[PDB]
Amino acid sequence: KAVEQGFNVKPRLNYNTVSGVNGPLVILEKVKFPRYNEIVNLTLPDGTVRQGQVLEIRGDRAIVQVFEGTSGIDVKKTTVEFTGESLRIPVSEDMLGRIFDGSGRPIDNGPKVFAEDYLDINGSPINPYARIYPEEMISTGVSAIDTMNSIARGQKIPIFSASGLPHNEIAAQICRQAGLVRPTKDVHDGHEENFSIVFAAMGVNLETARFFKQDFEENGSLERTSLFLNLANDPTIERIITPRLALTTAEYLAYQTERHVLTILTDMSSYADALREVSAAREEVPGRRGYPGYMYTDLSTIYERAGRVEGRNGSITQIPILTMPNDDITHPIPDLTGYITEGQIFVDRQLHNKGIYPPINVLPSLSRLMKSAIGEGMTRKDHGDVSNQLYAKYAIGKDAAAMKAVVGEEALSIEDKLSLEFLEKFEKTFITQGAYEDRTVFESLDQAWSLLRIYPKEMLNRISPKILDEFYDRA
C-alpha cells in the first residue's frame, strides 16, 4: 500500500542546445537518449520556465512543442532540462473546490495541490471487458434532453452548439439540475446525490469563465468542482493538455475514490484548433479541413475516458461543449465527435433566433444509449414510445412547414396541419424551458402526453396500442 518507491532522486539532464524554434514547437539537438513523451522545463533567457513536451524524437533531435507559447525563446541562452517522465499531474482529493489554470498550476490563492499520487495525464485504456454498461439515467431537468435524449450516468454526450448560442447556459443548467431519476435515497448522505463536477474551460472568453464560476458559487457546486480554466488570453498549446488534465483528475475522482463526477469540457472546438496548430507546425499530412489526420484518435483519447467500471462505484459522465463552426455538423470537429461520443445534444441557431430556450433541436440530437435507461423500473413506462412519437411528429411538422413554404396550404392534408400545430406547441411549450425550471422527467412526460393528445388515437401510430389505451385518455 506504501508508495515509498518514490523516495529516489534522478538528476535531470539540462541542455543548452536549442537548434531552432518555429511556431509553437522548439526543436532541440544533441539530446542523449530522448524519451518520446517526456516533458521539458525549458528556461527562457529571462529566467522564466516554460513547460514543453517532447513531440517526436529522432536520433539526437527532439521536436518539442512548448506550452505557454514560444514567444521570447531563443538559441544562445535557452536551457531545456529534461524531466525523465511523461506529464504527471499531482492529483489529490483536495483539489475538489478550487480553480486550476489550464496546465495544472492553481490560480486559486491556495498552494500547490498536496498530491497523494501522480497520475499520467494520458491515463490508460480501460479494459473493455472490465467496463460496465451505463444504465442509470440522470435527470438533467432539461425536458428537451431527459425525454428524448436522456443522458445516462457514464454516457458521453457533447452539447454541439453554434458560435454565439447559449450552450454555456445549458451546461450550467445541466450542472444545477443533474441527478439520477431514481436515486439511492432522499438524504444527501448515503445516496451521494451530488455529482462532483470537474469543469475544463479551454479557449473560452473570460466572461464565460466568470459565468461558470459564479453559477457554481450560486448553486453551491464550487465546493466540489475543479475548474480547469484556460482562458482566451491564456496560451494556445496549453489547450492540448487541459482536457487531459481534467479527465485524469476526473478518473482519479471517479474510479480511485468511488466519487460520481460530471466532466464538462467547454469549447472543445478550441481544442481541435490547438491540435490543428500543433500538427500544422509539424508539417504533418492534414486531414479533412487542415486538421491533423490523427484527430480521431487524439479526440477519442479525450472522450473515451468516460463511463462506469466493474467493481468501482464511480462513474465519469462528461458533456463536452463543442463550438461547431459555421453551424454545419459535417465540420470535422463535430463530425469526428459524432463518431466517438454516443449521441449529441444539438443546440440549434434558428430556434434560438425565435427565442426558444433551450434552443435544443430534437431531430439532430441523439443519445445512442438512451434506449437502455428508459422503460419500466427506471422512469415512466411509456418513455421510450413517447420519445419516438415526439421525434416522428416533430419531423412530420418540419416537413409540413417546408411544403407550406414551397406549396400553398391547400396541398397539406389534415395530418400536416395537425403536425404544424403540434410543432408550434412543441417548440413553444415543451422545448421552451426556464433557466431554472428543472422539469422532472415525469412531468416532462405528462407535458409530452398533453401535447400528443392533439392527434387522434388512431394517428399516434408509433405508440404501441397498449401504451395508447393506458395513457392517452387519462387526461
Binding site: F7, N8, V9, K10, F33
Partner: protein, 55 residues
C-alpha cells in the same frame, strides 16, 4: 438582508475557529513527524544512484 449582512463577523469567526482546530492538528502532526520525515528524506537525497541509461 440586514440579518445576513451583520452575520459576516459571526460566520467568519466560526469558520476561523473551525479552521484553527484543523490547523493546530496539522501543526501537532508535523512537529512530531518531521524528524522521521527529514531522516528518510535526507537519506533519499544523499544516496547515489550511479547507473547508465543505455538500457
Amino acid at each position: 438582508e440586514q440579518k445576513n449582512a451583520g452575520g459576516v463577523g459571526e460566520l467568519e469567526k466560526k469558520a476561523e475557529a473551525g479552521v484553527q482546530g484543523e490547523l493546530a492538528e496539522i501543526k501537532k502532526i508535523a512537529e512530531k513527524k518531521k524528524d522521521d520525515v527529514v531522516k528518510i528524506l535526507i537519506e533519499t537525497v544523499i544516496k547515489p544512484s550511479a547507473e547508465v541509461h543505455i538500457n
